Amino acid sequence: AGTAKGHNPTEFPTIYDASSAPTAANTTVGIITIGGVSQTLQDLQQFTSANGLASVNTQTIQTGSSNGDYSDDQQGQGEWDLDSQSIVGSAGGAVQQLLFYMADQSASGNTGLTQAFNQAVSDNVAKVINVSLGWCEADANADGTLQAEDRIFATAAAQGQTFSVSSGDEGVYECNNRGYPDGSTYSVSWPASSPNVIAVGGTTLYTTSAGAYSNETVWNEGLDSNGKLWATGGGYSVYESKPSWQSVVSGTPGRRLLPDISFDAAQGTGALIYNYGQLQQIGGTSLASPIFVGLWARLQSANSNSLGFPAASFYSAISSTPSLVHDVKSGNNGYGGYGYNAGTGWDYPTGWGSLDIAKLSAYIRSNGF
Ligand SMILES: [Ca+2]
């Protein structure tokens, strides 16, 4: 049912039933970036000004060496644009502050990125932090990145910060040269596979002619002209043990299952984003994560920034209270008859599905989180 089309970020509150919630004006939000954000900040000004919104207070943080390379990565600007504009739109047009935690590009291997995560946790000023990044978890494990970064995310969770991470754009084929079809061989993305973050998968979003929510299916747009799959990451970690709160999803391995929740990701139903001054229609789980971040930041502002790391609460609340989500039921995250299928309740492409924010807010008012 419904129509597939692009959406302005300011539509995400209506789509996900967040209009009645406070904005994120009382919550500080972080974004992890690789390199600088100079063009991104100009595109953010274009965004707020075009949409008639109050200006956003920003800070940029050099997270590594002061001699490091924080120049703009030109392609990267599109990611940081997607992230920042989608957060602010989903947040209802206001955030307390947006902090860009910039990784040094001249640091060895993944150490610049690790240091960006570390700085966000050490500072402990952002309540919610977006990470629209990922790569094969087995590569991260082999070189020690996984272990180093998991320690940082563990500290974040213990201090009550929410890291939100895109589940991946390769469907089940994360480790096969970043998304090439591989039959029955399935893998997942890091850092989404950490049990210390919220992993956010991807949907195809249909809206009614009046712009309301109609339905969501799995994000799976098939292969590009190079032969790479574009679909929501989902599956289970081969390394991370299942956190006890995931025991409510019976019949799954003793591993961290992902994603937890999902939001819009299909390019064909994606966000209209200003990138080097020009509007582009962009998707991915790189979109879904910042949608979650902006919506969650609203709930933080409604709760005096007192909500802790929410994974256990999501699993207990949603399993007992199906009205809190839009349960995705149709589609798959592989190719050629392979991959996982959506179904009733939690599934590997989409986790619990998307949040109905005003219903979740009412639940939190009654029950805590
Ligand atoms: Ca489902």
UniProtKB/Swiss-Prot annotation:
Cofactor(s) required for function per UniProt: Ca(2+)
Description of how activity is regulated: Inhibited by 1,2-epoxy-3-(p-nitrophenoxy)propane (EPNP), but not by carboxyl proteinase inhibitors, such as pepstatin, pepstatin Ac (S-PI) and diazoacetyl-DL-norleucine methyl ester (DAN). Inhibited by tyrostatin, pseudo-tyrostatin, AcIPF, AcIAF, chymostatin and pseudo-iodotyrostatin.
Covered range of the whole protein: 217 to 585 of 587
Effect of D169A: Loses both auto-processing activity and proteolytic activity
Binding site for Ca(2+): D327, V328, G343, G345, D347
Phenotype upon changing D327A: Loses both auto-processing activity and proteolytic activity
Task performed by this protein: Pepstatin-insensitive serine-carboxyl proteinase. In vitro can hydrolyze various synthetic peptides. Also shows activity on acid-denatured hemoglobin and on casein.
Residue span(s) of domain Peptidase S53: 3-367
Major location (coarse): periplasm
Keywords, ordered alphabetically: Calcium, Disulfide bond, Hydrolase, Metal-binding, Periplasm, Protease, Serine protease, Signal, Zymogen
S-S bridge residues: C136-C175
GO cellular component: periplasmic space
pH dependence: Optimum pH is 3.
Active site residues according to the UniProt entry: E79, D83, S286
Superkingdom of the organism of origin: Bacteria
Organism of provenance: Pseudomonas sp. (strain 101) (Achromobacter parvulus T1)
Temperature dependence: Optimum temperature is 50 degrees Celsius. Stable at temperatures below 45 degrees Celsius and completely loses its activity at 65 degrees Celsius.
Gene Ontology BP terms: proteolysis
EC number: 3.4.21.100
Protein name (Swiss-Prot/TrEMBL): Sedolisin
Modification after translation (UniProt): Autocatalytically processed.
Cofactor note (record): Binds 1 Ca(2+) ion per subunit.
Region of interest (Disordered), ranges: 60-79
Catalyzed chemical reaction(s): Hydrolysis of the B chain of insulin at 13-Glu-|-Ala-14, 15-Leu-|-Tyr-16 and 25-Phe-|-Tyr-26 and angiotensin I at 4-Tyr-|-Ile-5. A good synthetic substrate is Lys-Pro-Ile-Glu-Phe-|-Phe(NO2)-Arg-Leu
Effect on the protein upon substituting E216A: No change in activity with casein as substrate
Subcellular location: Periplasm
